[PDB]
Structure formats: C-alpha cells, structure tokens
C-alpha cells in the first residue's frame, strides 16, 4: 500500500492531498518547515499528492531532490 | 495501485487525467509551475494521464525527462 | 494493471485505444503534440493500443 | 495478464487476431505501415496472434527483429 | 496464463493444437510462411502445441530453433 | 500450469501421457518425426510424461 | 502492514500522526528525546506521518 | 505443482509411484530403457516416488546423478 | 506479520508497545537489562514500538545502533 | 508443497515416516539399497521424515551427505 | 510463519513467552544449557520472545551472537 | 509450511517438540543416533523445537 516520503529543503513547503473520485479538489494541505518530513500514503481518500517548494523526495520509483 | 511522478521543469505544466470507461473525456487538468511535483495515481476515474509541457516523469517502467 | 508510456516525437502522434470483446474497432484516438507524454493503461474498454507517429514508447518488456 | 509489442518495418504488416474457444478463426487484421506500433494483450476474445510481414516483436520471452 | 512464439523460418510450417481434456486429437493446424510469427497462448480447449517444419520457438522455458 | 517442451531428433519419438488418478495407463502417444516440437502440459488428465526416442527436452528444471 | 523507523538525534523529537479519512488532523504525537527509537506502523488510524526534529529514519524506501 | 524428472542410464530402470493416504503401498512401477525420460509429478495419489537403478535426476533441488 | 529485534547495550532498557486504535497510550514496558533480546511482534494490539536506552535494533528495513 | 530427496549411499537405509497430529508413530518404513533415490512429500500423514543409514539428502534448504 | 532460533552459550538461558492480546506476560520459560537450541515460532499466543543469557540467535533479519 | 533439518553428530541426540496453545510441555521426543537425519515440520501440533546433544541444523534462515 503505497507511500511517498518527503523532506523539506526550505520553509514553507506544502504537501496537497487530492481527493479520489469523479472530483479532484485540495481537501489538504500539510506545511513543512526546514527539514520536517512527511511520510503520506495514497488512501481511499487520495489519489494524488502535490509538492510546492524545494524538497526531497522518496518514492518506489527513486529519487527527485530539488 | 500504480501511479507516476511528474516533475515540471517550466511553468504552465498540465497533467490531464482522462476518464476511466467507454468515454474518454479530461475530467482534470493539474497545472504545475516550475520545481512542482505531482504524484499521482490511476484510479477507477482516470485509466490514463497526459503531461503537456516540459516534465520529468518517473513510472515503474523507467524515466523520461523533458 | 499493466500500463504503457508514450512521449510525441512529432506533432499530431495519435494514441488509438482498441475496444475490448468479439468487436475490434477504435473508440478513442488520442493526439500528442512534440514533448507531450501519454501514459496509458489497459482497461474494461481498451485491449489493444496503436501507436501511428514517431513516439519513444516503453512497456513493461523495454523500450 | 499478457501483452505483445509489435512494430511493423515495413508498410503493410498485419496482426491478425484468432479467437478464443473450440473454434479458430481470425476475427481480426490490423494494419501497420512502417514504424507504426500495436501494443496488443491476449483477452477473453484473442488467445492467438499471428503477424504477417517484417515486424520488431516483443514478449515477456524477448525479441524477435524480423 | 503461459504462451509460445512461433517464428517460421521456411514456407509451410503448421501450429497444431491438441485439444484439453480426456481426448487429444488436432483441432487445427495454423500454416505459417517463412518469416511468420504466431503467438498462442495454452486455452480451455488447447493443453498441446505441435509445430512441424523448420521453426524458431521460444517459451518461459528458454529458446529452441531449427 | 506447468509444460515440457520435447524436441525430436530421431524420427518416431513417442510423447506419452499417463493417465492422472488411482489408475497409471497411457490414454496417448503423440509421434514426432525428426526436428518436430511438442510443447505439452500437465493436464487435468495427464500427470507424467515419458518421452521415449532421442529428444532434446526442456523443463522448468533445466535441459 | 509498512512502518518507519525513526531515531531521535535531538531532545524532543515529535513524531506525528495524522488521522485516515475524510478528515486530516493530528491525533497523537510520540515525543523522543536524543538516541530513542520508534518503530511505527501506517494503521486504521494513522494514514500520514510527519517527524519535526533532527531525525534518523528508516523507511521501505530507504534513509 | 511439483514434478521430477527421470531419465534412464541403464536398462530396466523402474519408477515406482507410492500412494497418498495413511497406507503407503506401491501403486505403480514405470519401467524405464536406457535414455527414456519420465517427467511425473506429485499428484493426489503420488505422495512418494521410488527410482531404482542408474538414472539422472532432476527436481527443484537440482541434480542427482547416478 | 512483522516484528522488531532489540537487543540491550546496557541496563534498564525499555521497550514499550503503543495501543492499536482511534487512542493511543503505552499499554506495556519490557525492561531489558545489558545483552537481552526482545524480539516483539506488531499485533492486533500494538502498531508502534518504543525503545528508550542504548540498543542494537534489526528491522525489516536495516541495521540501528545505539 | 514441500519435498525430500534421499539418495542411499549403502544397503538398508531406512527412510521413516512420523504421523501428523498429536500423536506420534512411525507409520511407515522404506528401505532403499544403495544408488536408489526417493522422492517423499511432507503431507497430510506425515509432518516429520526420518533418515538412518548413510544417505544423500536435499532440500529446499540445502544439501546433508552421508 | 516467523521463527527465530536461539542457540544457548552458556548454561541457563532463557527463551521466555510472551501473551498475545491486550495483556503481555510471560506465559512460559524455556531453559537452555550451552549447545542446546529452540526454534520457536511467533504464534496465536505467542507475540513476543525475550531470551536471557549469551546466546546465538538467528531471525529473517540476520544474526545476533552474544 | 516451514521446517527443520537436523542432523545427529553424536548418539542420543533428542528433537523434541513442544505443544502448540496456551500450555507449553513436550509432546515427543525423537532421539537419533549418530549420522541420523530428521527432518521436521512445525505443524498443528508443535509450534517450538528444541535440540538437545551435537546436531548439524539446517533451517530456513541458515546453518
Ligand atoms: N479525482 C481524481 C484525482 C486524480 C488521480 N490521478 C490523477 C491524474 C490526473 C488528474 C487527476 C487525478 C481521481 O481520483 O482519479
Ligand atoms: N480505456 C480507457 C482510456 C484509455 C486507456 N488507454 C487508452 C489508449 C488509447 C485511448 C484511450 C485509452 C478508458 O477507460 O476510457
Ligand atoms: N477486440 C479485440 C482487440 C484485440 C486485443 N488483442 C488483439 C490481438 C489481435 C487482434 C485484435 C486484438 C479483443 O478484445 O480481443
Ligand atoms: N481456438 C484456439 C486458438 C489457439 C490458441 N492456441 C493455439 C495453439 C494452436 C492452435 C490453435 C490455438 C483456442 O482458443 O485454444
Ligand atoms: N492431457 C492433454 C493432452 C496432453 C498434454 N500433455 C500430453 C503429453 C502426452 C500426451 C498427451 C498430452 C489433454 O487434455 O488431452
Ligand atoms: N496415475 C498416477 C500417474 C503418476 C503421476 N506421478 C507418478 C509417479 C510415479 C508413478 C506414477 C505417477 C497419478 O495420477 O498419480
Ligand atoms: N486524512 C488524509 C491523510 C493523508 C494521507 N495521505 C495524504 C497526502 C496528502 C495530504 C493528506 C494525506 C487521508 O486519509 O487521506
Ligand atoms: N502414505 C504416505 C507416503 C509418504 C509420503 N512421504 C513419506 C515419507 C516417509 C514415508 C512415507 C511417506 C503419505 O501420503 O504420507
Ligand atoms: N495509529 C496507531 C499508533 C501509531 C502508529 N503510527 C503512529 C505515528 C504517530 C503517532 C501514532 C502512531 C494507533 O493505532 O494508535
Ligand atoms: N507435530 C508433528 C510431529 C513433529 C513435527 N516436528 C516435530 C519435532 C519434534 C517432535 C515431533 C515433531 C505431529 O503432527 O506429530
Ligand atoms: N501483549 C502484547 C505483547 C507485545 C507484542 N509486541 C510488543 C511490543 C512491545 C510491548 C509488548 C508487545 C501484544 O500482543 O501486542
Ligand atoms: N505453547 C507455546 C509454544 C511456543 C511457541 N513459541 C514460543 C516462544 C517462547 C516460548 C514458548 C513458545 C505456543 O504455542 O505459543
């Protein structure tokens, strides 16, 4: 059950949660400070993640770091 | 459930999911400026995804970037 | 599911969705323009994709 | 649940479709022209498939460059 | 479910399906001309494949040609 | 389900199939001739396989 | 069932997680001082994990 | 679904198959001429098999040659 | 299901389970003197672990020590 | 499910079978002379295998000879 | 189905039980004199081991020596 | 299901399995004289092993 990891780089970072279904909309939004992680799962209630700011981040797929 | 991983390398990055069924039609369009990161999953509404603009994508089967 | 991965090399790269069942038509046909990406899985509707066009296309067996 | 690439290379390649059940007919003939792709699964309708003409083939099993 | 490739490599090979069940006998034979390939997939109705003339085969288990 | 792939380097190369069950008997033998392939599976109704002539078999075990 | 492993390389490490549903808030918050550990499952409950504080932490996909 | 394969060194080569149950007795004896092979699985009535002679023996173990 | 090895580098090592659930409070303290090992499963009642004093750790994920 | 091979190495190895359940007997004896080889499930009836004399023996977890 | 197993080096070590369920005490205690091993599973009733004393000890994970 | 390998490098080696359940206590023991292999499976019954006397073991996790 699949999860994504993320390090903020900088201040103010926000980790969006979208929602599953017919409708996408933000129903999240999770701000980091400097060096806060968050580790988030898909869910049955999201579907997609969005990243604003620099950050590192950590999926099956590998490595995106800012 | 599988997903993607799109990174906009430029401003204006659209990530279109298409409806999942007999129709096929956008149902969302996610706009990403530059350094934004969208991870995001089919679902049982979006069976496929199209990324207009300059992206670097990660899926299960490898990388494409630009 | 499994899934495939299409980047337009050309403009008008048209993605063709085959209907699944006794019944082989197009229901879909998708354009990429140079530099769009279409990643695109298999469906209840869809059991067979064509791609006309220049394309890098990778699938679970390679590129 | 299985799939073949095929890429025509040369103009006028058919993939045909033969169908599933005590009988075997082609139900199906596709048409390449050269360097056009048909990524085709085996369904509840096709459990055979046969290509006519100089075609790259991918398999689960490899390559096979006509 | 598991399938063979079948390459012909001169005019007037046959891909011959025994059927599944208590029975065997043929229940058709597919002619491939030099250069042909058939893809056929093990089915309710087939548990035997027979190819005669000079083939290029492989399967799961590795590559068998001539 | 499991095959085995037997190909024929004699001519009259018997590929027999054991009846599955209480009882051991053969309900067939298929004949290849020289440089002809059988690929054949344990069935609901055949549980061994004897090949019987010289053969170059492959199994999930090995050649 | 997936977990995180995380060691507190200050006092006062918090390691937070945020409620599954609808709705997403904190529920509990696990303070570590310098050299703890946590091991901490994704659960019913807890569908996302932030850590505030200099952390070592392990997870399915690495450090 | 687990299988051994058996092949002949020598002449009068037998494979014994042993019955499944609370009662272990030989069921069945498959005689075996030099370079005949037998691939035979483990079944509802085979819990046991008994090779007697110079013979190649391949399972999922590896190899045993006498 | 999965589980944590933890062995104590000195005395008075604990290793607490955290409930399971909507609430979450220690419910359990294993005190580990020097060269101890507790190897702890997660269970329907415990869904996180906490280890205070100086430990060697082995997870599913790796190596933690001190 | 799994498997032992036995291969003897002298005359009059014994190959023994100990019930399943919450007893234990032997409920059955194979002797095998030397060169003879069997191939013996764990099944319903027998959850503990037994080897006196100087044997060859595989597993899935290795190989023990003499 | 998770086992560790635990090889004494010394006399008097202790493979101890611990309940499952919302309560956890030792429902038992194994003792080992040096050279002796216990391979023991995690079980319906049995969550969590504690082992007192030098001891080698083996688990998916890897080793732990005393 | 899981199992052991044990292989007697002295006489009188004892296997003993314990009972599966609430209550732990010895429900056999198999002793083995040099040389002699036991291999045992954790079963309905027993669902901890204890060797006692000079084995070579063989588990799933190693020697
Ligand atoms: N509401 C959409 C969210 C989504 C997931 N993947 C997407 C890809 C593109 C656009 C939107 C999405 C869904 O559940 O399907
Ligand atoms: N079949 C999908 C859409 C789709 C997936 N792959 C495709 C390839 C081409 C065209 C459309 C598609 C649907 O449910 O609508
Ligand atoms: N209508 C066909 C589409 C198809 C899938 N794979 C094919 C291979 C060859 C020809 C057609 C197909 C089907 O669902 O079966
Ligand atoms: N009607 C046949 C088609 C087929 C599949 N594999 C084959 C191999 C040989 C000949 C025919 C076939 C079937 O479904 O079984
Ligand atoms: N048992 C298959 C045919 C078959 C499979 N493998 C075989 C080997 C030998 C002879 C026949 C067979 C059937 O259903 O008829
Ligand atoms: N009639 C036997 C055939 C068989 C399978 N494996 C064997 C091994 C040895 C002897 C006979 C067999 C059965 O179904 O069980
Ligand atoms: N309440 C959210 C928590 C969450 C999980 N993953 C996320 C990603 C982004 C934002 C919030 C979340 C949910 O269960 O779905
Ligand atoms: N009748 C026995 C046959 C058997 C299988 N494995 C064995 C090992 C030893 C002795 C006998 C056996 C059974 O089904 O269990
Ligand atoms: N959600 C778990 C406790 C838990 C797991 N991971 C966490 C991370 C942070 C805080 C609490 C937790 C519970 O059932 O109570
Ligand atoms: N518990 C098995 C026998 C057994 C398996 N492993 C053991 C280890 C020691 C003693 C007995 C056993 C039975 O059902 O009887
Ligand atoms: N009674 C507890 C035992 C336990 C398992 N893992 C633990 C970790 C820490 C403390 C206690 C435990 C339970 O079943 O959950
Ligand atoms: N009666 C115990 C036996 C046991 C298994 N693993 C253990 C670990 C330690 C002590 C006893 C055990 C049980 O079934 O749970």
Redesign the interface.
């Known amino acids: 059950?699949?999860?994504?990891?993320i390090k903020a780089l900088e201040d103010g970072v926000n980790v969006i949660?979208?929602t599953?279904?017919?409708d996408?909309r933000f129903?999240?939004s999770?701000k980091?400070?400097k060096?806060?992680?968050?580790?988030?799962?898909?869910?049955?209630?999201?579907?997609?993640?969005?990243?604003?700011?620099?950050?590192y981040?950590?999926?099956?797929?590998?490595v995106?770091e800012?």
Chains 1, 2, 4, 5, 8, 9, 10, 11 share one sequence.
């Open positions: 059950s699949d999860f994504v990891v949660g979208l599953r279904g017919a996408t129903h999240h999770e980091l400070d060096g806060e992680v968050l580790i988030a799962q898909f869910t049955e209630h999201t579907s997609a993640i969005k990243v604003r700011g620099k950050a981040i950590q999926t099956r797929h590998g995106i800012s």
